[PDB]
Amino acid sequence: GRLIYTAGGYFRQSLSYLEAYNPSNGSWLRLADLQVPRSGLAGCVVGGLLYAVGGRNNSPDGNTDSSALDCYNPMTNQWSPCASMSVPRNRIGVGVIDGHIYAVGGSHGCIHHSSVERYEPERDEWHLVAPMLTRRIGVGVAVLNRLLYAVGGFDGTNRLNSAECYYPERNEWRMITPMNTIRSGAGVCVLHNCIYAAGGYDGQDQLNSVERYDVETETWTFVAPMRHHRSALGITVHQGKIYVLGGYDGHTFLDSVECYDPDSDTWSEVTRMTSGRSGVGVAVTMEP
Numbered sequence: 001g002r003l004i005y006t007a008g009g010y011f012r013q014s015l016s017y018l019e020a021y022n023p024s025n026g027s028w029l030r031l032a033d034l035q036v037p038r039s040g041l042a043g044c045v046v047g048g049l050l051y052a053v054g055g056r057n058n059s060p061d062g063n064t065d066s067s068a069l070d071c072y073n074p075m076t077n078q079w080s081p082c083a084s085m086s087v088p089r090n091r092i093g094v095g096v097i098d099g100h101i102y103a104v105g106g107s108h109g110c111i112h113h114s115s116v117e118r119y120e121p122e123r124d125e126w127h128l129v130a131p132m133l134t135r136r137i138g139v140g141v142a143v144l145n146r147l148l149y150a151v152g153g154f155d156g157t158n159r160l161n162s163a164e165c166y167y168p169e170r171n172e173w174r175m176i177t178p179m180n181t182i183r184s185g186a187g188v189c190v191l192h193n194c195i196y197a198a199g200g201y202d203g204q205d206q207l208n209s210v211e212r213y214d215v216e217t218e219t220w221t222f223v224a225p226m227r228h229h230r231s232a233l234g235i236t237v238h239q240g241k242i243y244v245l246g247g248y249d250g251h252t253f254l255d256s257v258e259c260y261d262p263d264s265d266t267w268s269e270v271t272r273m274t275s276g277r278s279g280v281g282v283a284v285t286m287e288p
């Protein structure tokens with residue numbers, strides 16, 4: 001696509017913002033607010049449309065975990081509700097395979113889910129698939145070569161270095177090599193042939209480290225760390241570079257956006273969000 005969209009998030013309370021960053025000229029555009037504020041959601045794009053999945057509305061009126069799926073059309077600048085998931089999923093992870101949205105893990109109150117469900121936009125229906133081997137909230141999800149990966153998180157008792165892969169034609173999850181770092185709330189994405197995990201919280205500190213899993217060699221390798229430690233960051237890929245957005249560094253809700261160039265193994269600051277926030281959903285599609 002052309003723009004990096006950030007939806008929702010948290011600063012003092014859950015947020016409704018939808019804002020779009022254009023890497024080609026540095027500009028930010030404020031677009032139509034989400035109908036319901038939410039943090040801990042995930043974003044993804046299918047068929048040019050932006051989807052906001054899950055989350056939680058932390059507000060003075062109370063706290064409500066979200067089973068919602070909502071769809072933003074850049075052509076109209078309007079959000080439309082879609083079918084809701086089987087369960088609320090705060091701190092969810094999502095990935096897209098073959099035009100279907102997989103919703104992974106997350107929490108509903110004290111319930112930490114291992115369940116996973118798949119949304120078919122052509123039918124506006126969700127269906128449960130095989131659950132993960134581990135309960136995971138704050139889980140990072142990415143897709144490579146039509147396989148789905150769930151990375152890190154929190155199982156209700158422990159933060160996790162483990163990761164697992166879903167094989168759709170077998171409707172089966174299998175563990176993969178664990179990361180070298182415990183990470184909940186990391187940013188997880190794919191670049192070339194590797195699954196990247198950036199940042200997160202290891203139980204003691206917010207992290208700046210970044211490691212990547214080569215699906216051929218089944219090993220994790222550290223790359224250059226981010227300039228800022230951050231948990232509950234948003235992450236996406238644009239033009240072969242990783243962008244990380246916001247998060248919490250143990251002191252401030254960050255407005256920093258950093259960009260990773262894999263050829264030089266360096267991170268640089270490329271813009272600031274209009275306000276600091278964590279727990280955003282992020283995805284890339286065409287300008288509105």
Ligand SMILES: COc1cccc2nn[nH]c12
Nearest residue numbers: 185201206231232248250
């Ligand atoms: C303050 O302790 C925490 C709990 C859960 C997630 C977190 N991310 N950064 N700090 C965290």
